[PDB]
Scaffold this motif. Structure first.
Motif, PDB file in Angstrom:
ATOM      1  N   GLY A 106      52.759  26.477  49.705  1.00  0.00           N
ATOM      2  CA  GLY A 106      53.615  26.173  48.578  1.00  0.00           C
ATOM      3  C   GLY A 106      52.952  26.574  47.281  1.00  0.00           C
ATOM      4  N   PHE A 107      53.737  26.518  46.211  1.00  0.00           N
ATOM      5  CA  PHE A 107      53.237  26.866  44.892  1.00  0.00           C
ATOM      6  C   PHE A 107      52.527  25.673  44.268  1.00  0.00           C
ATOM      7  N   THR A 108      51.416  25.947  43.591  1.00  0.00           N
ATOM      8  CA  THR A 108      50.635  24.877  42.996  1.00  0.00           C
ATOM      9  C   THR A 108      51.366  24.282  41.796  1.00  0.00           C
ATOM     10  N   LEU A 109      50.959  23.065  41.434  1.00  0.00           N
ATOM     11  CA  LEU A 109      51.534  22.404  40.268  1.00  0.00           C
ATOM     12  C   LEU A 109      51.242  23.185  38.995  1.00  0.00           C
ATOM     13  N   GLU A 110      50.088  23.853  38.941  1.00  0.00           N
ATOM     14  CA  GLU A 110      49.761  24.682  37.787  1.00  0.00           C
ATOM     15  C   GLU A 110      50.684  25.892  37.695  1.00  0.00           C
ATOM     16  N   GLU A 111      50.982  26.528  38.832  1.00  0.00           N
ATOM     17  CA  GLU A 111      51.892  27.670  38.835  1.00  0.00           C
ATOM     18  C   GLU A 111      53.308  27.257  38.454  1.00  0.00           C
ATOM     19  N   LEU A 112      53.768  26.110  38.957  1.00  0.00           N
ATOM     20  CA  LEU A 112      55.113  25.645  38.636  1.00  0.00           C
ATOM     21  C   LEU A 112      55.251  25.341  37.151  1.00  0.00           C
ATOM     22  N   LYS A 113      54.216  24.748  36.549  1.00  0.00           N
ATOM     23  CA  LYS A 113      54.246  24.490  35.113  1.00  0.00           C
ATOM     24  C   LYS A 113      54.305  25.788  34.320  1.00  0.00           C
ATOM     25  N   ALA A 114      53.526  26.791  34.732  1.00  0.00           N
ATOM     26  CA  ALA A 114      53.537  28.076  34.040  1.00  0.00           C
ATOM     27  C   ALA A 114      54.903  28.743  34.137  1.00  0.00           C
ATOM     28  N   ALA A 115      55.549  28.650  35.298  1.00  0.00           N
ATOM     29  CA  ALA A 115      56.877  29.216  35.478  1.00  0.00           C
ATOM     30  C   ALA A 115      57.974  28.375  34.840  1.00  0.00           C
ATOM     31  N   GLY A 116      57.657  27.170  34.373  1.00  0.00           N
ATOM     32  CA  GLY A 116      58.634  26.334  33.706  1.00  0.00           C
ATOM     33  C   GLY A 116      59.477  25.466  34.609  1.00  0.00           C
ATOM     34  N   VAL A 117      59.045  25.225  35.844  1.00  0.00           N
ATOM     35  CA  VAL A 117      59.793  24.423  36.804  1.00  0.00           C
ATOM     36  C   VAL A 117      59.017  23.143  37.078  1.00  0.00           C
ATOM     37  N   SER A 118      59.690  22.004  36.944  1.00  0.00           N
ATOM     38  CA  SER A 118      59.078  20.724  37.261  1.00  0.00           C
ATOM     39  C   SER A 118      58.988  20.540  38.770  1.00  0.00           C
ATOM     40  N   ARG A 119      57.962  19.805  39.202  1.00  0.00           N
ATOM     41  CA  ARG A 119      57.760  19.579  40.628  1.00  0.00           C
ATOM     42  C   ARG A 119      58.881  18.759  41.255  1.00  0.00           C
ATOM     43  N   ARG A 120      59.619  17.987  40.455  1.00  0.00           N
ATOM     44  CA  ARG A 120      60.719  17.196  40.998  1.00  0.00           C
ATOM     45  C   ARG A 120      61.906  18.073  41.374  1.00  0.00           C
ATOM     46  N   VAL A 121      62.187  19.109  40.583  1.00  0.00           N
ATOM     47  CA  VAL A 121      63.325  19.975  40.875  1.00  0.00           C
ATOM     48  C   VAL A 121      62.966  21.129  41.802  1.00  0.00           C
ATOM     49  N   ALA A 122      61.685  21.499  41.889  1.00  0.00           N
ATOM     50  CA  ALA A 122      61.295  22.641  42.710  1.00  0.00           C
ATOM     51  C   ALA A 122      61.613  22.399  44.178  1.00  0.00           C
ATOM     52  N   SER A 123      61.348  21.187  44.667  1.00  0.00           N
ATOM     53  CA  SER A 123      61.684  20.859  46.048  1.00  0.00           C
ATOM     54  C   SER A 123      63.190  20.847  46.269  1.00  0.00           C
ATOM     55  N   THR A 124      63.964  20.532  45.229  1.00  0.00           N
ATOM     56  CA  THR A 124      65.415  20.486  45.357  1.00  0.00           C
ATOM     57  C   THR A 124      66.045  21.874  45.375  1.00  0.00           C
ATOM     58  N   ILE A 125      65.463  22.838  44.661  1.00  0.00           N
ATOM     59  CA  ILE A 125      66.015  24.188  44.591  1.00  0.00           C
ATOM     60  C   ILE A 125      65.345  25.133  45.585  1.00  0.00           C
ATOM     61  N   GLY A 126      64.505  24.612  46.474  1.00  0.00           N
ATOM     62  CA  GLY A 126      63.930  25.416  47.531  1.00  0.00           C
ATOM     63  C   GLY A 126      62.572  26.016  47.249  1.00  0.00           C
ATOM     64  N   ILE A 127      61.843  25.506  46.261  1.00  0.00           N
ATOM     65  CA  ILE A 127      60.498  25.981  45.950  1.00  0.00           C
ATOM     66  C   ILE A 127      59.506  24.987  46.551  1.00  0.00           C
TER      67      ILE A 127
END
Lengths: 147, 96, 202
Positions: free
Chosen positions: C73-94
């Motif tokens: 999976g994508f790290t929390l640091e990568e998700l922050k850089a891409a602008g996606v919160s960890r709460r929604v990433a699991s919901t949209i398939g990340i």
RNA sequence: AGAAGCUCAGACGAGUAGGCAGGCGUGGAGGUUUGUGACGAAGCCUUGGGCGUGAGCCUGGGUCGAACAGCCUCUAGUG
RNA sequence: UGAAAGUGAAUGCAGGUGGGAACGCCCUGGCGUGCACCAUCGACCGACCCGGAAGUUUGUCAAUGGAAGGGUUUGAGU
RNA sequence: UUGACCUCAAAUCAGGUAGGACUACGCGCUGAACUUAAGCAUAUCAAUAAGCGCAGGAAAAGAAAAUAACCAUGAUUCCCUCAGUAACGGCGAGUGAAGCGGGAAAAGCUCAAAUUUGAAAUCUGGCAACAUUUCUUUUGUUGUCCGAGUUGUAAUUUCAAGAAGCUGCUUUGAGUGUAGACGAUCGGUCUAAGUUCCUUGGAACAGGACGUCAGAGAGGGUGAGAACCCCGUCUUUGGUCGAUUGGAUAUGCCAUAUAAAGCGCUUUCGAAGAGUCGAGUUGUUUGGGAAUGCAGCUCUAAAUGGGUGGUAAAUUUCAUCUAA
């Protein structure tokens, strides 16, 4: 199959090709590698020397991956390139020298067996032999270490 | 050595990042409430018999004997040395 | 009792092995079962792709660090850089990998542009039809089941083609450098001790 | 002149244990034969005939009543 | 290749020599020519026994490093 | 003296639950010998058989006190590979893993340790009302009493953090019908063509003429080898009509955001599981060799502390992870 085997030719012959004087007994000489120093010593010494005893020091938790270092010789370096790259650069004087990354070819060291053509070449590798480098520099090329 | 497989700084150089500090690594840091509670419990409970024996030895200045007894009681010399420094701090504070 | 040519026998068959023989006569059956389950999942999960996006990571050894594979999976640091919160990433398939980290900017960027490509090509349906909230798509008529590998494959680093030979490369003994670095690393511990002993002696 | 065929000549021929080769027989599978069969398949009986060094094979007569075979290959719980 | 650390295969047309399949030329030989295989003499790589030239930095006086060269030792090598 | 509480009893008290069978596959415990080593005692057989306990439709395992030493990977399980390898072995007979890498499948999370303290906000049961149903057989809701609970039930937090703060954008139901559509579903049903002549026969389903059907020449039955006599077969992932279920859709009603939530910065703070870890020792196990796991006994921690980095010790660094 079964029809082109023996026991289809020994049908009728008593003892099935194992003889009368001695017969086919279960384990007349012992099971498996039993012996090797007592009654199998003649076979073991003449056909498998070095089988008994320890040589060297143990390594605990050996892992092959840090030791991974396949070797390629100089006479295969140009074959590591695509055919188009060889056509473009082999034997032609150009300002820009072809580069072979043998690591992507699956090699951890470049060995010096064989000859290398006179065209300059850049060899990207992790390890290299002393005279492997001498021939590469002799051919006008350079060796760059990769890590 | 950087980018040369062998050496001291061996390996590929690819910029560098400062990793965020993981909250799990904070474990072992002494907290304010934990320090307060443990001080209360130490006052309420006291010391174990072997802790008492070590403190007497430290008072009588057999440091090697106290160290060897603490290693015998705790099992490892590291835990022994930690206990000696813990108990000598108790001695110094009580003299204070 | 062993008198023929060849190597000495090594058959580990002194237990009750026939009790535990495993046959593969159900290999075609399992393959069809996995196909049917995969197709059942494909039809059941709607437009959503059957495989979630995965990060591009490097295997952890000298034997394999030159390759790129798929991560968990994508790290929390990568998700922050891409602008996606960890709460929604699991919901949209990340997928989210809280254990991994970005020790290099290269690995960080690699997966950030992967998320950016995924976000650009992603159609998110509004939770209530006809009421597009933030991130929700306005048109979902063209939604389809596509392959994440086709939309965003795992790319391998390709070595640059021919490059010019410079003089600092010409004046570089590769073998001597390899030997010197190995010896330097071997005896660095002894040097540190000698420098110490010299200090107290001085 | 099924050249994997035809033809000529010479020498030679004992055999346990054992090795190798070419053949005969049996059940099942693929192909094949416009294959045989209730106008009698398979099986069985036979002081009938015929073939092969042999393993065997074919056939006349009798009995019988539902299936079976040649060839090329595959296979085996095959004498 | 060595127990390992490690190092790691062209002086030569990838050498000589002897016999050699097939071929060519000459008048049965001779002359070339020599695949394959053995006999053999070397060359190269790793160990083993010496020998320590550079070079690297750290101890420069040294520390580390290993070149040329020699053994007629060895390997399931080239 | 009455009371409160604690502890411990009784009842054919009110309502529940447990056993037994099954055991192919699951988790444990307990546990051999024949056998092999051409004898045999360590070993091997085998951490097997027998014995015993406890499950499920799978079980177990599982969101790192995990690897690695990389440019680093990232719950578990299984497959291939690693690998008959590292290693263990009267170093004899024999035994023998793991990291990586490729694949199948993927999914994450919950408490304890926090003062709600301007409000036990929490829950079983009795009663009565409604409602609901695979179902008069099922499952709830609301009210009201009695109790449970402050020796701690909710809300909030789980280290990946978080908690309090600091403005400011963003996001929001554990709902109920009804309608029709679109899917799935056991099942009642629906289904093409010679029984025309001749011969043989006890029987034509044989042989021969002449046809037919075929998305049906699978297979049976019928007095002998039947596509056309019969059941079926193909059409069929389907027409059909009768109930079921699924995710959407149309609106209807009920819904106190007076709420809740993500995100962002904090000069900040950040509670993190003990006769447990660890050590010695004795057994038993492992490929684990200066103990691999487990167990018994003895001793018993700690707070950047505790694990682990597959040669024991002291010491000093570095990674990693965060047990009980």
């Amino acid at each position: 199959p079964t029809h082109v085997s023996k026991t289809r030719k020994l049908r009728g012959h008593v003892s099935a090709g194992h003889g009368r004087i001695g017969k086919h007994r279960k384990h007349p000489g012992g099971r498996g590698k039993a012996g090797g120093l007592q009654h199998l010593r003649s076979h073991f010494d003449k056909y498998h020397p070095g089988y008994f005893g320890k040589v060297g020091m143990r390594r605990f938790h050996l892992m092959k991956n840090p030791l991974w270092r396949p070797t390629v010789n100089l006479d295969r370096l140009w074959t590591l390139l695509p055919n188009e790259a060889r056509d473009k650069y082999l034997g032609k004087n150009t300002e820009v020298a072809p580069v072979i990354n043998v690591l992507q070819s699956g090699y951890g060291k470049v060995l010096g067996k064989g000859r290398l053509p006179e065209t300059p070449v850049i060899v990207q590798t992790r390890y290299v032999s002393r005279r492997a480098e001498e021939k590469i520099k002799q051919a006008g090329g350079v060796v760059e270490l990769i890590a | 050595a950087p980018g040369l497989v062998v050496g001291l700084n061996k390996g590929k150089t690819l910029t560098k990042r400062q990793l965020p500090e993981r909250p799990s690594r904070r474990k072992g840091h002494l907290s304010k409430r934990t320090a307060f509670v443990r001080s209360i419990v130490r006052e309420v409970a006291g010391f174990a018999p072997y802790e008492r024996r070590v403190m007497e030895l430290i008072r009588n200045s057999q440091d090697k004997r106290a160290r060897k007894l603490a290693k015998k009681r705790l099992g490892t010399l590291k835990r022994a040395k930690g206990k000696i420094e813990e108990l000598t701090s108790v001695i110094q504070s009580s003299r204070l | 009792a062993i008198h023929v040519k060849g190597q000495l026998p090594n058959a580990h068959f002194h237990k009750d092995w026939q009790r535990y023989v495993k046959t593969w006569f159900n290999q075609p059956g399992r393959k069809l079962r996995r196909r049917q389950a995969r197709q059942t999942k494909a039809a059941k999960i709607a437009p959503r792709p059957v495989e979630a996006i995965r990060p591009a990571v490097k295997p952890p050894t000298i034997r394999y660090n030159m390759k790129v594979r798929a991560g968990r999976g994508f790290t929390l640091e990568e998700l922050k850089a891409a602008g996606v919160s960890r709460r929604v990433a699991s919901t949209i398939g990340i997928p989210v990998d809280h254990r991994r980290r970005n020790r290099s900017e290269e690995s960080l960027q690699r997966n950030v542009e992967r998320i950016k490509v995924y976000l650009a090509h992603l159609i998110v349906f509004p939770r209530k039809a006809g009421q597009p909230k933030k991130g929700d798509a306005t048109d979902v008529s063209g939604a389809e089941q596509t392959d994440v590998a086709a939309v965003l494959p795992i790319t391998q680093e390709a070595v640059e083609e021919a490059k010019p030979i410079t003089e600092e490369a010409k004046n570089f003994n590769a073998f001597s450098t390899l030997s010197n670095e190995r010896a330097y690393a071997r005896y660095a511990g002894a040097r540190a001790a000698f420098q110490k002993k010299r200090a107290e002696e001085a």
